[PDB]
Amino acid sequence: SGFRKMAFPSGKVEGCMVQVTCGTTTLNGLWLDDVVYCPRHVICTSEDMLNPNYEDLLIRKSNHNFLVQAGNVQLRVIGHSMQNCVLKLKVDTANPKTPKYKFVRIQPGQTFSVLACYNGSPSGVYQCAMRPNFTIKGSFLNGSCGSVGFNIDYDCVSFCYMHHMELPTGVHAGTDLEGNFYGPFVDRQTAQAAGTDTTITVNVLAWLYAAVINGDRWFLNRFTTTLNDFNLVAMKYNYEPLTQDHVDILGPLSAQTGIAVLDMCASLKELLQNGMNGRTILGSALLEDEFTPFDVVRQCSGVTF
Amino acid sequence: SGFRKMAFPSGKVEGCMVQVTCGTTTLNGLWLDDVVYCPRHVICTSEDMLNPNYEDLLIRKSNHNFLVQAGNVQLRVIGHSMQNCVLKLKVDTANPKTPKYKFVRIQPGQTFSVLACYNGSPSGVYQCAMRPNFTIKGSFLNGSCGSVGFNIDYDCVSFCYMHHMELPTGVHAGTDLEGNFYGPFVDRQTAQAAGTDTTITVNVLAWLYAAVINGDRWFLNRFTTTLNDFNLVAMKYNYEPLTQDHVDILGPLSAQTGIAVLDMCASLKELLQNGMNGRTILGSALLEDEFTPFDVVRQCSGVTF
Numbered sequence: 001s002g003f004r005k006m007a008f009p010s011g012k013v014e015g016c017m018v019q020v021t022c023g024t025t026t027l028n029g030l031w032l033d034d035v036v037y038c039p040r041h042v043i044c045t046s047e048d049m050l051n052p053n054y055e056d057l058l059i060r061k062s063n064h065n066f067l068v069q070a071g072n073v074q075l076r077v078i079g080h081s082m083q084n085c086v087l088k089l090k091v092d093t094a095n096p097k098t099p100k101y102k103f104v105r106i107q108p109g110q111t112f113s114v115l116a117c118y119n120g121s122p123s124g125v126y127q128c129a130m131r132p133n134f135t136i137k138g139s140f141l142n143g144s145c146g147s148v149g150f151n152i153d154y155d156c157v158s159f160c161y162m163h164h165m166e167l168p169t170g171v172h173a174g175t176d177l178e179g180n181f182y183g184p185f186v187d188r189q190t191a192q193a194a195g196t197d198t199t200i201t202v203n204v205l206a207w208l209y210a211a212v213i214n215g216d217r218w219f220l221n222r223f224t225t226t227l228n229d230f231n232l233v234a235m236k237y238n239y240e241p242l243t244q245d246h247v248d249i250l251g252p253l254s255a256q257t258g259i260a261v262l263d264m265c266a267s268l269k270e271l272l273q274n275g276m277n278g279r280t281i282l283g284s285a286l287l288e289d290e291f292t293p294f295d296v297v298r299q300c301s302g303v304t305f
Numbered sequence: 306s307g308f309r310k311m312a313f314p315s316g317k318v319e320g321c322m323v324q325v326t327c328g329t330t331t332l333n334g335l336w337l338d339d340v341v342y343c344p345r346h347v348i349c350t351s352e353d354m355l356n357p358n359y360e361d362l363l364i365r366k367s368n369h370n371f372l373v374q375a376g377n378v379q380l381r382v383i384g385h386s387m388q389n390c391v392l393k394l395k396v397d398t399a400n401p402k403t404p405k406y407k408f409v410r411i412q413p414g415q416t417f418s419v420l421a422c423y424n425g426s427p428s429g430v431y432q433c434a435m436r437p438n439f440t441i442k443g444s445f446l447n448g449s450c451g452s453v454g455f456n457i458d459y460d461c462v463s464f465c466y467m468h469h470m471e472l473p474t475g476v477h478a479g480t481d482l483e484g485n486f487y488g489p490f491v492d493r494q495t496a497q498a499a500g501t502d503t504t505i506t507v508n509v510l511a512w513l514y515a516a517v518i519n520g521d522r523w524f525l526n527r528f529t530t531t532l533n534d535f536n537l538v539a540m541k542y543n544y545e546p547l548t549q550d551h552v553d554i555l556g557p558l559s560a561q562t563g564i565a566v567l568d569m570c571a572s573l574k575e576l577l578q579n580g581m582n583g584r585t586i587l588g589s590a591l592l593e594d595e596f597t598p599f600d601v602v603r604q605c606s607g608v609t610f
């Protein structure tokens with residue numbers, strides 16, 4: 001037993017990380033087959049970043065201006081192109097460590113692992129959620145851009161995130177691997193602000209199911225509710241509305257525990273209205289919303305890759 | 306910015322994981338050079354585990370009784386021996402993926418990454434502390450034993466933990482890689498209990514320094530204290546006594562922030578006596594003690610491997 005915020009094993013992604021330098025700017029790239037994907041702001045001077053014209057800036061860049069290094073060894077760049085907010089650098093060598101992979105654009109409320117990198121070298125791994133407001137709560141410094149987020153389904157790596165920037169509240173914005181931002185963010189150093197940080201209601205319920213599976217049971221009550229009744233409470237606390245689709249996704253955890261989703265909603269309602277009275281659930285003194293139903297089942301059943 | 310519970314990249318360890326079966330029992334092993342290390346209770350029937358005589362049980366086991374599988378391929382066992390609570394299986398092939406490695410017995414209050422495995426296959430990665438009471442708060446199911454804990458110093462993997470068992474409170478006990486338990490635990494299914502779960506005081510202070518570095522500053526106060534004065538408060542709250550050695554280890558974080566360790570102790574004292582008044586620090590509503598000073602510096606400076 002026990003329940004931890006748990007990342008995917010990072011080895012398959014570590015083998016894809018490279019360093020990309022253009023002029024004096026160095027960040028990370030992802031090497032898959034004969035392509036290196038990296039944030040297009042590698043071509044910018046610090047000054048360019050205030051108001052960049054990326055197409056105009058790219059005119060001045062040739063293949064040889066892109067220095068790509070895989071550990072200690074230089075890759076030869078034989079082509080380049082911009083797709084949305086990412087550059088694709090064609091190199092003369094297919095990455096021999098390329099795993100089975102897909103590009104996916106994840107939905108808000110889904111989780112993924114981040115392999116934080118600097119100079120093409122991995123620093124660490126942690127789990128994040130795509131928040132309803134299309135930000136993530138990461139850990140990123142100067143040089144981290146091009147660090148990616150991913151999921152693994154047995155042998156297949158689904159890349160869903162590439163790191164580009166930080167907003168106030170120290171939250172993080174970036175793109176899918178087609179270079180399209182999550183949310184309304186742009187890759188320019190100008191005032192941008194995150195919207196309301198809504199709580200992922202279905203994830204809080206999944207985590208309450210994890211707590212029950214682990215014998216943390218004190219918050220189970222004698223009450224039930226309805227979707228509409230619960231949602232009137234959700235709304236006051238900036239929780240996402242719960243739908244029948246959410247109830248259906250919680251079906252495995254409801255079946256394993258014998259607790260109806262609406263009974264668990266009645267427990268959640270009491271926790272939102274009364275707080276936790278200085279008690280903990282799975283060692284937390286707040287309600288956790290960065291575990292998906294699938295994360296709880298994966299962790300509680302010991303699914304491997 | 307941002308501050309996350311962050312594991313080491315797991316790739317170097319993933320390449321060392323194998324499956325070990327003896328009779329009907331399957332667990333994980335660690336393959337380094339031509340040796341596979343695994344928990345000795347692989348040789349036990351469920352019934353044996355109530356009161357095992359490991360030397361007597363091992364008489365009945367030969368090299369061929371140890372089925373070792375590295376992904377899909379069988380390793381040939383050419384020798385076996387018991388060292389404390391681990392078996393060492395000599396195989397006819399040196400692991401071609403062996404990293405630069407050391408075995409270290411960590412001190413209580415130090416952190417490490419766990420690569421949770423089942424059937425020799427990685428499930429996930431998370432960060433743990435060796436708690437003062439010589440347990441860890443992990444996430445382990447049936448089949449997880451032989452999962453290891455480690456640190457990386459640039460290219461060198463320091464293995465410090467091998468998973469053996471679960472105690473009440475759903476906490477975890479195991480050995481160093483010489484097969485010596487942390488704490489007084491034995492590898493027998495008989496009533497054993499964890500001692501008092503003391504808080505790692507130096508780690509809480511390190512995390513308060515991380516919060517300041519991140520602009521979470523509300524808890525800084527107008528007060529200072531002394532070691533002896535602070536420690537009279539520590540003791541009531543089951544905090545480890547703070548020593549000058551702890552103060553010296555916090556020197557980098559004190560110097561970076563300009564906040565004297567004793568001033569931060571005065572802030573900690575107010576938080577212990579008054580609580581957090583429903584406020585958060587780095588998104589937590591409790592004081593976090595599983596980041597070491599070195600973890601905070603590593604994360605806040607972007608150290609790579």
Ligand SMILES: *C(=N)[C@@H]1C[C@H]2C[C@H](NC2=O)C(=O)NCC(C)(C)[C@H](NC(=O)OCc2ccccc2)C(=O)N2C[C@H]3[C@@H]([C@H]2C(=O)N1)C3(C)C
Nearest residue numbers: 041140141143144145164165166187188189190191192306
């Ligand atoms: C990638 N290597 C880098 C990522 C990190 C820099 C650091 N945290 C990161 O995630 C950080 O301090 N980032 C904040 C700054 C100001 C540097 C901007 N953010 C930004 O401009 O957001 C809009 C804003 C502007 C002014 C005030 C408030 C909000 C930032 O992250 N970046 C500016 C520049 C690149 C990016 C960056 O440094 N990425 C791009 C957006 C092109």
Ligand SMILES: *C(=N)[C@@H]1C[C@H]2C[C@H](NC2=O)C(=O)NCC(C)(C)[C@H](NC(=O)OCc2ccccc2)C(=O)N2C[C@H]3[C@@H]([C@H]2C(=O)N1)C3(C)C
Nearest residue numbers: 001346445446448449450469470471492493494495496497
């Ligand atoms: C390794 N494959 C396995 C690890 C896991 C089993 C699971 N969690 C684990 O970490 C679990 O439920 N473990 C608890 C049980 C009861 C199975 C024992 N713990 C134990 O005996 O602790 C002492 C105790 C006895 C009775 C009541 C209270 C405490 C346990 O973990 N194991 C029994 C047997 C191996 C180990 C195990 O299953 N490891 C060994 C200790 C030889």
